[PDB]
Amino acid sequence: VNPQRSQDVYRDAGKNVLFLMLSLNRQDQTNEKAAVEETADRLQAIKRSLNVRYPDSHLRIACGISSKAWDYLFPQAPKPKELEDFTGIKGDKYDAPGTPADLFFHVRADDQSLTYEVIDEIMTFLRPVTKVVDETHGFRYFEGRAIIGFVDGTENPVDADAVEWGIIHEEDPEFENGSYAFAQKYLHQMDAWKSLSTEQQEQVIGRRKFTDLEQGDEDKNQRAHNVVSQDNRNDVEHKIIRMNVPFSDPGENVTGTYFIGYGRYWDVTKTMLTNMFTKNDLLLDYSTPVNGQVFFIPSIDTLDKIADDEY
Ligand code: HEM
Numbered sequence: 001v002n003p004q005r006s007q008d009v010y011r012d013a014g015k016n017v018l019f020l021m022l023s024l025n026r027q028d029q030t031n032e033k034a035a036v037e038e039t040a041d042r043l044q045a046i047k048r049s050l051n052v053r054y055p056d057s058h059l060r061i062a063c064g065i066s067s068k069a070w071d072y073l074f075p076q077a078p079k080p081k082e083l084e085d086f087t088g089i090k091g092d093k094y095d096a097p098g099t100p101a102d103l104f105f106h107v108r109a110d111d112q113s114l115t116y117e118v119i120d121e122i123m124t125f126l127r128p129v130t131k132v133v134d135e136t137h138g139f140r141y142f143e144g145r146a147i148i149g150f151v152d153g154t155e156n157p158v159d160a161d162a163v164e165w166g167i168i169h170e171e172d173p174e175f176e177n178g179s180y181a182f183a184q185k186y187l188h189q190m191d192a193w194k195s196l197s198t199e200q201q202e203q204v205i206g207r208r209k210f211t212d213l214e215q216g217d218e219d220k221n222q223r224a225h226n227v228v229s230q231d232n233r234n235d236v237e238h239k240i241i242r243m244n245v246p247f248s249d250p251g252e253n254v255t256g257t258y259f260i261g262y263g264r265y266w267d268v269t270k271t272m273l274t275n276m277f278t279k280n281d282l283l284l285d286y287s288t289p290v291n292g293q294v295f296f297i298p299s300i301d302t303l304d305k306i307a308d309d310e311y
Pocket residue numbers: 146148150151152153154155156184186205207225226227229230231242244257259261269272273283287
């Protein structure tokens with residue numbers, strides 16, 4: 001495993017965020033493939049250039065390919081072990097939808113100008129062969145809190161744990177240092193949420209609001225977000241890297257969280273998601289999912305194979 005050959009899957013969610021889902025036109029496979037191959041080279045060149053121009057601005061990029069896109073572009077080729085089509089989850093109280101999509105970009109920087117420029121330069125190659133599925137603009141709230149006012153990402157794995165849980169190792173050697181990324185846009189019912197007491201919100205989440213100290217298990221609701229969202233199969237505490245992001249039009253009162261979770265194992269994310277939706281996570285009473293798809297995030301070297309037309 002070498003995290004230096006990974007895309008930016010494992011660390012910084014960033015002060016200014018852009019999320020873009022595209023579909024391929026499915027009009028001319030050859031020409032569409034040719035433009036994805038150009039894009040695999042150009043996207044790295046664009047990051048190099050902006051990192052030269054703005055080295056203090058923490059530019060981070062992750063770009064992804066869905067199962068459907070992979071089957072259409074690379075029909076003759078190997079496929080990452082756990083790459084599948086997400087079609088939604090049938091839950092108890094609540095369902096989650098699946099969204100058809102082919103390409104994903106998660107762009108983060110200290111300034112919105114750099115997130116604008118990455119996408120504007122990439123779309124010179126990709127606009128003639130795509131349509132937009134979703135485009136969301138996100139930001140870091142005060143003290144890295146989610147827009148609901150609780151600290152976002154405290155139980156994320158960090159340093160060696162982030163590598164361990166974030167990127168593909170020797171189990172799938174063709175695609176080592178890749179990642180599986182699940183994108184899921186939620187709208188919040190901020191009015192209802194704001195009418196709860198602090199203590200009522202703390203029951204929903206499983207932690208104290210101001211200090212962010214985890215509640216003692218004796219005091220938690222068993223449907224609290226930080227209980228049901230876990231994957232503890234086989235007495236192992238499975239992790240992914242969550243870099244969740246507020247988005248808002250606060251004039252219109254349209255506010256939400258765009259979930260983005262990077263894992264070595266799609267199987268772990270999918271299990272956490274199944275647990276939430278079958279056991280009725282309390283946070284789902286204030287959170288309505290409106291899209292969702294999973295993408296494979298290639299390593300640097302997999303991008304180089306794609307650019308050189310090996311798949
Ligand atoms: C509206 C969407 C979401 C919001 C606002 C949200 C918010 C939070 C908050 C505030 C925490 C506690 C701080 C922390 O340890 O990070 C947390 C923890 C967590 N969330 Fe979420 N979350 C959302 C969606 C999801 C989704 C879709 C998943 C899984 C697919 C997930 C999995 C987790 C996990 C595993 C933890 C850590 C629990 C622990 O080990 O204590 N969350 N989330």
